[PDB]
Design a protein around this ligand. Sequence first.
Ligand SMILES: NC(=O)c1ccc[n+]([C@@H]2O[C@H](COP(=O)([O-])OP(=O)(O)OC[C@H]3O[C@@H](n4cnc5c(N)ncnc54)[C@H](OP(=O)(O)O)[C@@H]3O)[C@@H](O)[C@H]2O)c1
Ligand SMILES: CN(Cc1cnc2nc(N)nc(N)c2n1)c1ccc(C(=O)N[C@@H](CCC(=O)O)C(=O)O)cc1
Length: 157
Amino acid sequence: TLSILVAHDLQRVIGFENQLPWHLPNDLKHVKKLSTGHTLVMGRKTFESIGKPLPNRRNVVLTSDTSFNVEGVDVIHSIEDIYQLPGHVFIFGGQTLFEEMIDKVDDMYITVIEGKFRGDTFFPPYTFEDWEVASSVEGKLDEKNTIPHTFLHLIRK
Ligand SMILES: NC(=O)c1ccc[n+]([C@@H]2O[C@H](COP(=O)([O-])OP(=O)(O)OC[C@H]3O[C@@H](n4cnc5c(N)ncnc54)[C@H](OP(=O)(O)O)[C@@H]3O)[C@@H](O)[C@H]2O)c1
Ligand SMILES: CN(Cc1cnc2nc(N)nc(N)c2n1)c1ccc(C(=O)N[C@@H](CCC(=O)O)C(=O)O)cc1
């Protein structure tokens, strides 16, 4: 299976100045639960903003840089390489990879952040006419998670 994994706000903002505009620990645990034991594919800027590979799963970075070699990271240089990765593969970001892959993935795990943040990078527009809602779960709010959010699993019709 080839899936998108993304958190975007009410206007589809995903990032600002190579960081996330929000901090939402529940969403990072969502990422950890979905992706532990599988594969993440991310663009070079997304990788550099995380700084290190995420533990207990395969980290694949797409870059044109043939000098890229990071301990604990597999490197690919073409979109077509993604289709050779075995197992459950999550397209992890950022804007460039989401734009390149949204028409190719089987399904999307989207966290809708119910706020309007300042952004400079966006998830591409999509319509529910193309996507069935396999599940929709409101995130629980607490002291450490103060922004309303919803976990959507969307499957291509
Ligand atoms: N909210 C979320 O769910 C989420 C998730 C992830 C990231 N983000 C945010 O998204 C933003 C980054 O997005 P972005 O679009 O600027 O960057 P990005 O997609 O993370 O990385 C772009 C880079 O990926 C490489 N790349 C992409 N397509 C390629 C291809 N077809 N062939 C070879 N290399 C390719 C290139 O690297 P080279 O230039 O090295 O060749 C390109 O410069 C940040 O703000 C980050 O915080 C948000
Ligand atoms: C900046 N970044 C990219 C990022 C952030 N939120 C997302 N949220 C969703 N839904 N999808 C993504 N693609 C996504 N990507 C990050 C930053 C930190 C960690 C991280 O430390 N995750 C730990 C969990 C951290 C924790 O337990 O609090 C993990 O094991 O995956 C993940 C991605």
